[PDB]
Design a protein around this ligand. Structure first.
Ligand SMILES: Cc1cc2nc3c(=O)[nH]c(=O)nc-3n(C[C@H](O)[C@H](O)[C@H](O)COP(=O)(O)O)c2cc1C
Ligand code: SF4
Lengths: 429, 71
């Protein structure tokens, strides 16, 4: 078909821009907490089944099919109280879609905590707010106190027979702590250092108890996915990728904004319609980082007709992460921008594993050389090889997230890197 | 390393490294002789016998004349 058009009655995250009251008496008017008693009474298997049928995929960088992820949790509880850590923490460069759910309609996030908790047989939800979101977690603790006073959460899930309580943890400025296997530890009290995957969080995660880490957007669309139609949700986007992603058009657009819109939308259509347009017209575009910062670039010659869905952006030698589209026009120093991205991945890399801990400082040094031109024309093949040495070997996908920006920069703008290097050469002598 | 040991300011690339080491000059060295050039330009078989025999004929005539003078 032809995607992109989402009508104001189809946007799931109403009160995104905080125009209306976020808390109760303002959330019940937006349908929040509408009839969750019935949903909880409809059971856990029905919730998982409707989430799988709705084809909701991971709103976070992983892109995993939710629901199927929620079916990983154990059915019969063997004494370990299954938890539900909500990955409120983002810290991905470009990504504010979580910041508009923690505040500005947080009750959708709390009701999603509850509905996913009954969905995955959980017993408590730890909304891991990003550390810097102080005002956001204050709004969320206000809404949590409300949903506790209104009998929604705690010792009876919205009057139902489900004991489910939402506790609000908050980290402290660490993009690495945001990872699924590192959220469990940074919340366990230890450092935010990921654990290896052979113990999966669904098998032994938080406190060793089973758990599933869900981004706020996936857990927060869960309520309206169930209350509305799972067929209605899956009616958006392409076949596999389906839903209404919450985008964040980040930089070098004349009107930067985060706006919810149907997935599989043409990136050019999103840019030209909602956020205005690439500063100086579309012909001024240089590159676009379509996902968060954990995704390769798009050099504007494959950015005209690319759709903002997981599958197509993966097929374009890139990825749709948090869909925090970062736009860069012909006026920016794209090598300097990717150098600052690699500096970010050097800073926010908990250093647990050698391929990332060291090679990311290495990528930052090579990028801060190539952005001046101090390198040699064969280093652009070392940089590719260094990134491919980091990629598959790191404990978590941060190694990926640090090798992918530089890999995409090389793959696409190798002419510009080579030009800077040759210009440095001719500047000498 | 090995691009920070052989600098050659500029060079834009890992090739074109200085690479100045010992070797023959452009065009090689001169053609060096190895054969045995032993010049046989001496007195021949004759001219050596005829120098000797000329002496043991005139010089012996002189010995004779000296014997005549001494006698
Ligand atoms: C490199 C990397 C970056 C991540 N970035 C985010 C992020 O920005 N936001 C988030 O909620 N989770 C993030 N995560 C955690 C997971 O990838 C995933 O987003 C989360 O555990 C579940 O989200 P989902 O249920 O929507 O797939 C990140 C993990 C890795 C390895
Ligand atoms: S070194 Fe990189 S991959 Fe390893 S735990 Fe730290 S951030 Fe994750």
């Amino acid at each position: 078909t032809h995607f992109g058009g989402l009508k104001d009655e189809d946007r799931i995250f109403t009160n995104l821009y905080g125009l209306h009251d976020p808390f109760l008496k303002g959330a019940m008017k937006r349908g929040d907490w509408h009839r969750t008693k019935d949903l909880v009474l409809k059971g856990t298997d029905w919730i998982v089944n409707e989430m799988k049928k709705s084809g909701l995929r991971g709103r976070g960088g992983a892109g995993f099919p939710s629901g199927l992820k929620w079916s990983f949790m154990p059915k019969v509880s063997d004494g370990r109280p299954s938890y539900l850590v909500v990955n409120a923490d983002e810290s991905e460069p470009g990504t504010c879609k979580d910041r508009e759910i923690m505040r500005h309609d947080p009750h959708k996030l709390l009701e999603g905590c509850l509905i996913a908790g009954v969905g995955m047989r959980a017993s408590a939800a730890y909304i891991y707010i990003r550390g810097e979101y102080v005002n956001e977690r204050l709004n969320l603790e206000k809404a949590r106190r409300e949903a506790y006073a209104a009998g929604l959460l705690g010792k009876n899930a919205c009057g139902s027979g489900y004991d489910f309580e939402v506790y609000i943890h908050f980290g402290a400025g660490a993009y690495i702590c945001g990872e699924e296997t590192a959220l469990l530890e940074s919340l366990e009290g230890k450092q935010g250092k990921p654990r290896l995957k052979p113990p999966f969080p669904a098998n032994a995660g938080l406190y060793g108890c089973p758990t599933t880490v869900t981004n706020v957007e996936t857990v927060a669309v869960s309520p309206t996915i169930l209350r509305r139609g799972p067929e209605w949700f899956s009616s958006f986007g392409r076949k596999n990728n389906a839903g209404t992603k919450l985008f964040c058009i980040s930089g070098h657009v004349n009107k930067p904004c985060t706006v919810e819109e149907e997935m599989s939308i043409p990136l050019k259509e999103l840019i030209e319609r909602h956020c205005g347009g690439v500063r100086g017209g579309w012909d001024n575009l240089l590159a676009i980082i379509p996902g968060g910062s954990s995704v390769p670039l798009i050099p504007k010659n494959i950015c005209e007709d690319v759709l903002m869905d997981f599958d197509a952006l993966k097929a374009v030698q890139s990825g749709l992460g948090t869909a925090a589209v970062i736009v860069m026009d012909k006026s920016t120093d794209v090598v300097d921008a990717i150098a600052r991205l690699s500096y970010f991945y050097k800073h926010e890399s908990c250093g647990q594993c050698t391929p990332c801990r060291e090679g990311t400082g290495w990528l930052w040094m090579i990028m801060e050389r190539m952005k001046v031109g101090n390198a040699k024309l064969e280093e652009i093949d070392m940089l590719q090889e260094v990134t491919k040495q980091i990629e598959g070997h790191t404990i978590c996908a941060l190694g990926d997230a640090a090798a992918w920006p530089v890999q995409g920069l090389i793959r696409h703008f190798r002419p510009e890197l080579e030009r800077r290097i040759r210009e440095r050469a001719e500047r000498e002598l | 390393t090995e691009a920070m040991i052989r600098n050659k300011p500029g060079m834009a690339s890992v090739k074109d490294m200085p690479l100045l080491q010992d070797g023959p000059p452009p065009g090689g060295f001169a053609p060096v002789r190895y054969a045995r050039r032993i010049s046989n330009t001496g007195p021949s078989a004759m001219a050596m016998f005829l120098a000797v025999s000329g002496a043991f004929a005139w010089g012996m005539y002189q010995v004779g004349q000296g014997n005549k003078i001494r006698r």
